[PDB]
Curated annotation (Swiss-Prot), chain A:
Anything else known: ZWILCH gene is deleted in a patient suffering from colorectal cancer with chromosomal instability.
Family of the protein in this entry: Belongs to the ZWILCH family.
Record note on quaternary structure: Component of the RZZ complex composed of KNTC1/ROD, ZW10 and ZWILCH; in the complex interacts directly with KNTC1/ROD.
Subcellular location: Chromosome, Centromere, Kinetochore
Protein name per UniProt: Protein zwilch homolog
Membrane-spanning segments: none
Domain of life, source organism: Eukaryota
Biological function: Essential component of the mitotic checkpoint, which prevents cells from prematurely exiting mitosis. Required for the assembly of the dynein-dynactin and MAD1-MAD2 complexes onto kinetochores. Its function related to the spindle assembly machinery is proposed to depend on its association in the mitotic RZZ complex.
Curated annotation (Swiss-Prot), chain B:
Additional notes on this entry: Overexpression as well as silencing of ZW10 disrupts the morphology of the ER-Golgi intermediate compartment as well as the Golgi apparatus and slows down ER-Golgi transport.
Annotated family: Belongs to the ZW10 family.
Coiled coil (UniProt feature): 1-81
Role, per record: Essential component of the mitotic checkpoint, which prevents cells from prematurely exiting mitosis. Required for the assembly of the dynein-dynactin and MAD1-MAD2 complexes onto kinetochores. Its function related to the spindle assembly machinery is proposed to depend on its association in the mitotic RZZ complex. Involved in regulation of membrane traffic between the Golgi and the endoplasmic reticulum (ER); the function is proposed to depend on its association in the interphase NRZ complex which is believed to play a role in SNARE assembly at the ER.
Stretches for region Interaction with RINT1: 1-268
Signal peptide residue numbers: none
Quaternary structure and interacting proteins, as annotated: Interacts with NBAS and KNTC1/ROD; the interactions are mutually exclusive and indicative for its association in two different vesicle tethering complexes. Component of the RZZ complex composed of KNTC1/ROD, ZW10 and ZWILCH. Component of the NRZ complex composed of NBAS, ZW10 and RINT1/TIP20L; NRZ associates with SNAREs STX18, USE1L, BNIP1/SEC20L and SEC22B (the assembly has been described as syntaxin 18 complex). Interacts directly with RINT1/TIP20L bound to BNIP1/SEC20L. Interacts with C19orf25 and ZWINT. Interacts with ZFYVE1.
Top-level taxonomy: Eukaryota, Metazoa, Chordata, Craniata, Vertebrata
Native source organism of the sequence: Homo sapiens
Record's protein name: Centromere/kinetochore protein zw10 homolog
Cellular location(s): Cytoplasm; Endoplasmic reticulum membrane; Chromosome, Centromere, Kinetochore; Cytoplasm, Cytoskeleton, Spindle
Residue range from the parent sequence: 50 to 390 of 779
Tissue/organ expression: Widely expressed.
Curated annotation (Swiss-Prot), chain C:
Function of the protein: Essential component of the mitotic checkpoint, which prevents cells from prematurely exiting mitosis. Required for the assembly of the dynein-dynactin and MAD1-MAD2 complexes onto kinetochores. Its function related to the spindle assembly machinery is proposed to depend on its association in the mitotic RZZ complex.
Modified residues (Phosphothreonine): T170
Protein localization: Cytoplasm; Nucleus; Chromosome, Centromere, Kinetochore; Cytoplasm, Cytoskeleton, Spindle
Subunit structure: Interacts with ZW10; the interaction is required for stable association with the kinetochore. Component of the RZZ complex composed of KNTC1/ROD, ZW10 and ZWILCH; in the complex interacts directly with ZWILCH.
Chain positions with Phosphoserine modification: S180
Protein name: Kinetochore-associated protein 1
The gene coding this protein: KNTC1
Tissue: High expression in testis.
C-alpha cells in the first residue's frame, strides 16, 4: 500500500534492472506512463508479488558469479 | 493529480459497501423473526449501528452524485449540451440542499461545495447570457434619443432563424434549447423582464406616439428583420384601427417566430409545470401597454361633435378583434381588460 | 485555484500563463481573483485590479462576478456576525463595480439599460442591508409587501419620535446646550432608499393623525 501511494503520487522514479520478471516493475512502468489502476491485495497475491522479486535477485546474484568467474554461460 | 482513478475506485467500493450493508441487514432480519424473545435486543442494538452506517453511506452517495453531476456538466459544457448540463446542475443542487438540511459534515466542506456550485452556476449563466445576444440583435442609432424621427428610422431588430442546419465551425444551439436551459435554471423570468422592456421602449411605445411610423417585417429564411419605415400622414394623432393593426402585425411574428417553441422543466422533477411564453411576456408588458394605448390613442379619438358619434362605432368593433387575437395568442389570461372597458 | 491558494504575489501571474499556454480565457483568472478577494473582504484590491485591467476583459469579469454575487446572495441568510458582514461587503463591493461598468457601457444601449437596472437593484439591496441589517433573498427583496411594511413601520416610528417630543411631562436635563441628532434626519437616511420625500411624509402623517382624532395637527400640516 505504501508503494502504491508513492507510485500514484509520482514522488519517486525507482531504479530498475532488465528482465523485469516481477510485476512490481511493470507497475512502476505503468506509473511512468501516467496513472495506473488501484492494485488489490487479497489472498496469496501479496506473497507472490514479493516472491517474484527474490527469484530475480537470486538469479542475478548467480549469473554475476557463473559468468563472472567464467564457470558457466547464459 | 493522483485521484482520477481513485474516483472510480470510490464508486466501486461504495457500491460494494452498500451491497454489504443490504446483505447484512437481510441476514439480521432473517434471524430476528426466528428468535423474537431471546435474540431481539442484541440484534437490534447492532442493527442501530448498521442503520447509522447506512445513513452515512447514503450521505456519501449524495456526495458522489454531487461530484458526478458536476463532472458530467463540465463535459457537457465543451460539447455545448447546455440542457443536460443544467439538469445535472439541478440534480447537484437537490443533493446539496439535502446535504445542508442535515447537520453531519464540517461547515467549511459544505462552504466549499456551495462555492463551487455557485461558480459552476455563474459559469453556465454567463455562457447563456453570451449566447442570448448573438441570436437576438438590437441595432440602435448612435444616440439615446427616442423623440426624433431618425431615432426610429435607425432602429432595427434581428432574429437569427436557424432555418438550415448550421455549417459554421462556431455553432449556435437552437432558440428552443436556449429557452429550455433558461427555464431549467429559473432565469427566464429575468431575461423576459429585460427583453420585454426594451421591446416596449423601442418598438411598442413608438407605434402609439407617432402616426407616421410603419413596421416593415422582412422575412428572410435565416434573418427576420423588423424595421421602421416612415410614411407621411396628415393626422395629428394616430387613429385606433391602424395602431391596433400595426401592433398585431408585430405581435403575430413575435409569437410565431420566437414564442412558438415548447418548454420543458427539470428532467427528474414533474412537480413543476410549463407556462406558455406569451403569458409571461404579456404579463410584463400588457400593463404598461394598455395605459400607453389609452393615454395616447383612445383619448384623442373621442369626437367633439355629437354628429360624429356614430362613426366611433368601428373603433368599438376594431378594438374587440384586437382584444380577441391576443386572447387566441395567449398574450392575455382573462376576457375583459381595461383597454376594452 | 491551487496557485491562487498559495497567496504568492506572483501567483496571479503564475496562474495567468497556465490558462494562456493551455488556451483558456483570462476572464476566469481575474473573475476568480476578484471572487477570492471578495471572500477575504478585500474589495479595494478588486477595484485596483479592475482599474488596471483593459475595459474589454473588465466588462467580462464584472458581469460574471455580479452574477456570482447575486447567486451567492440568493441562498439562505447567515445569522452569524461574519455572515452578515460578508453580505454587506459583497453588496458594497458590487455597487461601485456596477458604477464602473455603467461608466464603461455608456454607448452600448442594449447593455446600458440592463446595467442601470441591475445597479438600481443592488443599490436598493445594499441601502436596505446597511441602514436596517435586514438580509434575505432577492425573491423576498423584490416583493413589494416587505417594502410597504418597512415603509409603514418607519412612518409609525416617526409618529412616535415626535409624539414623545410634544411635552406630556416636564423636560429632562438631556440635550441641554448639546442637542441630539434629529429623528427626522435618521428617518430620511432610512427613506433615501425608500424614495420618500418630505411631501409624501407629511401627506401620510396628516392621514395618520386624522385617524387618531387629532384635528389641529392635520390642519396645520395641510396649511403649511
Amino acid at each position: 500500500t505504501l508503494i502504491i501511494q508513492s507510485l500514484q503520487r509520482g514522488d519517486i522514479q525507482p531504479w530498475l534492472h532488465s528482465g523485469s520478471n516481477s510485476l512490481l516493475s511493470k507497475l512502476i512502468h505503468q506509473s511512468y506512463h501516467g496513472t495506473m489502476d488501484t492494485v488489490s491485495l487479497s489472498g496469496t497475491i501479496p506473497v507472490q508479488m514479493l516472491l517474484e522479486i527474490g527469484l530475480d535477485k537470486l538469479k542475478k546474484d548467480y549469473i554475476s558469479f557463473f559468468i563472472g568467474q567464467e564457470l558457466a554461460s547464459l | 493529480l493522483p485521484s482520477m482513478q481513485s474516483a472510480q475506485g470510490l464508486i466501486t467500493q461504495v457500491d460494494k459497501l452498500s451491497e454489504d450493508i443490504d446483505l447484512l441487514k437481510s441476514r439480521i432480519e432473517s434471524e430476528v423473526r426466528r428468535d423474537l424473545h431471546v435474540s431481539t435486543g442484541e440484534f437490534t442494538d447492532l442493527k442501530q449501528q448498521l442503520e447509522r452506517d447506512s445513513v452515512v453511506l447514503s450521505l456519501l452517495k449524495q456526495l458522489q452524485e454531487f461530484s458526478t453531476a458536476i463532472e458530467e456538466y463540465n463535459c457537457a459544457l465543451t460539447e455545448k449540451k447546455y440542457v443536460t448540463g443544467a439538469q445535472r446542475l439541478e440534480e447537484a443542487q437537490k443533493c446539496l440542499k439535502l446535504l445542508k438540511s442535515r447537520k453531519c459534515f464540517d461547515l467549511k466542506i459544505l462552504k466549499s461545495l456551495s462555492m463551487e456550485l455557485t461558480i459552476q452556476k455563474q459559469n453556465i449563466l454567463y455562457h447563456l447570457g453570451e449566447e442570448w445576444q448573438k441570436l437576438i440583435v438590437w441595432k440602435f442609432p448612435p444616440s439615446k434619443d427616442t423623440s426624433s424621427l431618425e431615432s426610429y428610422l435607425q432602429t432595427e431588430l434581428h432574429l437569427y432563424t436557424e432555418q438550415s442546419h448550421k455549417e459554421e465551425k462556431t455553432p449556435m444551439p437552437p432558440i428552443s434549447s436556449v429557452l429550455l436551459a433558461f427555464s431549467v435554471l429559473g432565469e427566464l423570468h429575468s431575461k423576459l423582464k429585460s427583453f420585454g422592456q426594451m421591446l416596449l421602449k423601442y418598438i411598442l411605445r413608438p407605434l402609439a406616439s407617432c402616426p407616421s411610423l410603419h413596421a416593415v417585417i422582412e422575412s428572410q429564411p435565416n434573418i427576420v428583420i423588423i424595421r421602421f419605415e416612415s410614411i407621411m400622414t396628415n393626422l395629428e394623432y394616430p387613429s385606433p384601427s391602424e395602431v391596433f393593426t400595426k401592433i398585431r402585425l408585430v405581435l403575430e411574428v413575435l409569437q410565431k417566430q420566437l414564442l412558438d417553441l415548447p418548454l420543458d422543466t427539470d428532467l427528474e422533477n414533474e412537480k413543476t409545470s410549463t407556462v406558455p411564453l406569451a403569458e409571461m411576456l404579456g404579463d410584463m408588458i400588457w400593463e404598461d401597454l394598455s395605459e400607453c394605448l389609452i393615454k395616447n390613442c383612445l383619448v384623442y379619438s373621442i369626437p367633439t361633435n355629437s354628429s360624429k358619434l356614430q362613426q366611433y362605432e368601428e373603433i368599438i368593433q376594431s378594438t374587440e378583434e384586437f382584444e380577441n387575437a391576443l386572447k387566441e395568442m395567449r398574450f392575455l389570461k382573462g376576457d375583459t381588460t381595461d383597454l376594452l372597458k | 485555484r491551487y496557485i491562487l491558494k498559495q497567496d504568492v504575489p506572483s501567483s496571479l501571474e503564475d496562474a495567468l500563463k497556465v490558462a494562456q499556454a493551455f488556451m483558456l480565457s483570462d476572464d476566469e483568472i481575474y473573475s476568480l481573483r476578484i471572487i477570492d478577494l471578495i471572500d477575504r473582504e478585500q474589495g479595494e484590491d478588486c477595484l485596483l485590479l479592475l482599474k488596471s485591467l483593459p475595459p474589454a476583459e473588465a466588462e467580462k469579469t464584472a458581469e460574471r462576478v455580479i452574477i456570482w454575487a447575486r447567486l451567492a446572495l440568493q441562498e439562505e441568510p447567515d445569522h452569524s456576525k461574519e455572515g452578515k458582514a460578508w453580505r454587506m461587503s459583497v453588496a458594497k463591493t458590487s455597487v461601485d463595480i456596477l458604477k464602473i461598468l455603467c461608466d464603461i457601457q455608456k454607448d452600448n444601449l442594449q447593455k446600458k439599460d440592463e446595467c442601470e437596472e441591475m445597479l438600481k437593484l443592488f443599490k436598493e439591496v445594499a441601502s436596505l442591508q446597511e441602514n436596517f441589517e435586514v438580509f434575505l433573498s432577492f425573491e423576498d427583496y423584490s416583493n413589494s409587501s416587505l417594502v410597504a411594511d418597512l415603509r409603514e413601520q418607519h412612518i409609525k416610528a416617526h409618529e412616535v419620535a415626535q409624539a414623545k417630543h410634544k411635552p406630556g411631562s416636564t423636560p429632562e436635563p438631556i440635550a441641554a446646550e448639546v442637542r441630539s441628532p434629529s429623528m427626522e434626519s435618521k428617518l430620511h437616511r432610512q427613506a433615501l432608499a425608500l424614495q420618500m420625500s418630505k411631501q409624501e411624509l407629511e401627506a401620510e402623517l396628516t392621514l395618520r393623525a386624522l385617524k387618531d382624532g387629532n384635528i389641529k395637527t392635520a390642519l396645520k400640516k395641510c396649511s403649511d
